[PDB]
């Protein structure tokens, strides 16, 4: 049936057919995580009374602690929770490295400015995010909680602000051809300008408190993970591993990789992680993806019989049920995973075809000199193809062989000459 679906037909002709994988691969998951047990200093980023202004936004380096982002993610005190490059739901299981938390205060119209790749006034002169930024921006209205000319900004910056940099210089900006003598004149103004927050001025000018959390990644073993539970790792079975945020699906198997102590991940030529170091126990488990897919069925044609043989490409006949995950397969599929007709050819493990010691012409080419044929009661037999009839002309000097008769034989050579002339109207 898998072959009939691969060819999208209800009738299958004689031969070998490579079959696409229609089977249930996925299974349980593991969340193996490091041994860090302490809450991050996330409390003093959102419940602090003092907040430095936007021109002097305050940055803290959170590292080496667990932090339940769900406690921030569930609170209704926030209005904008815009996450770029990540999903707030997935912030829990993800383990990042070297989290950065910046905090400041802006006005209502200025909240939109806090976003990657955007031109504005504070976004261009006071706090500029990178063009690509993996993290979140959380801004909440605090109108009747902070309003007062304490908060200020840099109205007149020279050209712009390099992303992720601070500048609190009080030098007077030069805004004209006349060189700035040092005191603010007609061509010179104070960049440090403050707007007095009023308790009743309008929604646009209501103060807002903003925190930007940036989680850099691909920066050596991560430390700041979420509130995940380190589950017991299970080998030799399909899993969904989460080794320090290294999500993936496959089979974990004990490996002989040397894995010098500083190395942690391991990769193949295609830059795909085919190994891992378990954070709890420093053991190397290579990852072999599930969904075998390398299966070819041998059919004598559905017109003749519904019997089939199954060839697993390079699997070893003992390891056939371990591969293809025969435990999860249907019972009709399991008949072709083990039995009394297993035969190990150099082209793989063949199940369902009985090996015979005779040799005939190749009917269905299996490979490596092995062929298969439906013969009679009737069954599929696998043999070694015979090269030809075994004759021998006895070479003898001073002896010749001369024909005393002839035969007129008419052969037949078919040669294609032309194919169908077709045209396609592209439009």
């Amino acid at each position: 049936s898998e072959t009939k679906c691969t060819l999208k037909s209800f009738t299958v002709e004689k031969g070998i057919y490579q079959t696409s994988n229609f089977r249930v691969q996925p299974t349980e998951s593991i969340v193996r995580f490091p041994n860090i047990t302490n809450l991050c200093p996330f409390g003093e980023v959102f419940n602090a009374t003092r907040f430095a202004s936007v021109y002097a936004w305050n940055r803290k380096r959170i590292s080496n602690c667990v932090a339940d982002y769900s406690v921030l993610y569930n609170s209704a005190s926030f209005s904008t929770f815009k996450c770029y490059g990540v999903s707030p739901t997935k912030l829990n299981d993800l383990c990042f490295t070297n989290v950065y938390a910046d905090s400041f205060v802006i006005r209502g119209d200025e909240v939109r400015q806090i976003a990657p790749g955007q031109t504005g006034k504070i976004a261009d002169y006071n706090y500029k995010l990178p063009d690509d930024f993996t993290g979140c921006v959380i801004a909440w209205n605090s109108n009747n909680l902070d309003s007062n000319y304490n908060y200020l900004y840099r109205l007149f910056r020279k050209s712009n602000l390099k992303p992720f940099e601070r500048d609190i210089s009080t030098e007077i900006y030069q805004a004209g051809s006349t060189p700035c003598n040092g005191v603010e004149g007609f061509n010179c103004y104070f960049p440090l300008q403050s707007y007095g927050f009023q308790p009743t001025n309008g929604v646009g000018y209501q103060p807002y408190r903003v925190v930007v959390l940036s989680f850099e990644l691909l920066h050596a073993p991560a430390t700041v993970c979420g509130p995940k539970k380190s589950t017991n790792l299970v080998k030799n079975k399909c899993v969904n591993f989460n080794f320090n945020g290294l999500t993936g699906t496959g089979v974990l198997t004990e490996s002989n990789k040397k894995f010098l102590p500083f190395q942690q991940f391991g990769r193949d030529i295609a830059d795909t992680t085919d190994a891992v170091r378990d954070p709890q126990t420093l053991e190397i488990l290579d990852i072999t993806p599930c969904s075998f897919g390398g299966v070819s069925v041998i059919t004598p044609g559905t017109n003749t019989s519904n019997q089939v043989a199954v060839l697993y490409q390079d699997v070893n006949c003992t390891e056939v049920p371990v591969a293809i995950h025969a435990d999860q397969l249907t019972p009709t599929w399991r008949v072709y995973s083990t039995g009394s007709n297993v035969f190990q050819t150099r082209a793989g493990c063949l199940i369902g075809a009985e090996h015979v010691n005779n040799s005939y012409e190749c009917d269905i080419p299996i490979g490596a000199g092995i062929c298969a044929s439906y013969q009679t009661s009737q069954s599929i037999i696998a043999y070694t193809m015979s090269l030809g009839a075994e004759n021998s002309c006895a070479y003898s000097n001073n002896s010749i062989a001369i024909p005393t008769n002839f035969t007129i034989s008419v052969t037949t050579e078919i040669l294609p000459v032309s194919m169908t002339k077709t045209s396609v109207d592209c439009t």
Binding site: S399, I400, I402, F406, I408, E413, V417, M419, T420
Partner: protein
């Protein structure tokens, strides 16, 4: 032989099957979203304003252009293959129907005699009339025959022996002949050749001279 064997014209039917499969795949690739909200342009156009319908229409355009390019490339490759086969067929018609070819196995298993063309759907069938030897017989052979001080080699033939006497035949048909001077030529004495045997080469002039 042509009728009883089912897959006799297999390579002529493969052309039709391949063309039909390619065209069917090209037609069926018109029912794929390629990421768009639908695989029908009218559904996209009747549900979406132009600025937002342009994205889905562009996705459909890219997918269908990719399908057309794949079809044209595979058709160019197949046309190159068919052109090679047609050049071979033209060479075979020139060298085997219009002549007699000495090339081995070019026009059948055996010594080529003639060929006959027969048109078939999308191709040509050559009936190769050839000559195959049969009913072999083993004889004793000698590179040369030593007459009185001279070595005789067969002009066009080979020396065989039916057990007691020596004949010279043609190499492709047993037609033994009496070894005479008109059958052989002399190229020295009986010292250099390895395997030279002793026999008599009859001269078809001594009986005339006697009488």
């Amino acid at each position: 032989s042509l009728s009883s064997t089912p897959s006799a014209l297999g390579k002529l039917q493969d052309v039709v099957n391949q063309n039909a499969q390619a065209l069917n795949t090209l037609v069926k690739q018109l029912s794929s979203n390629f990421g768009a909200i639908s695989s029908v342009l009218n559904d996209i156009l009747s549900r979406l304003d132009p600025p937002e319908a342009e994205v889905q229409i562009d996705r459909l355009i890219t997918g269908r252009l990719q399908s057309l390019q794949t079809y044209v490339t595979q058709q160019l490759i197949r046309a190159a293959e068919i052109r090679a086969s047609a050049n071979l067929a033209a060479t075979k018609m020139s060298e085997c129907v219009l002549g007699q070819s000495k090339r081995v196995d070019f026009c059948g298993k055996g010594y080529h005699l003639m060929s006959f063309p027969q048109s078939a759907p999308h191709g040509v069938v050559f009936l190769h009339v050839t000559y195959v030897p049969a009913q072999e017989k083993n004889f004793t052979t000698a590179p040369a025959i030593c007459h009185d001080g001279k070595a005789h080699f067969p002009r066009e033939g080979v020396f065989v022996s039916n057990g007691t006497h020596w004949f010279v035949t043609q190499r492709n048909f047993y037609e033994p002949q009496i070894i005479t001077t008109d059958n052989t030529f002399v190229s020295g004495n009986c010292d250099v050749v390895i395997g030279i045997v002793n026999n008599t080469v009859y001269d078809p002039l001594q009986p005339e001279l006697d009488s």
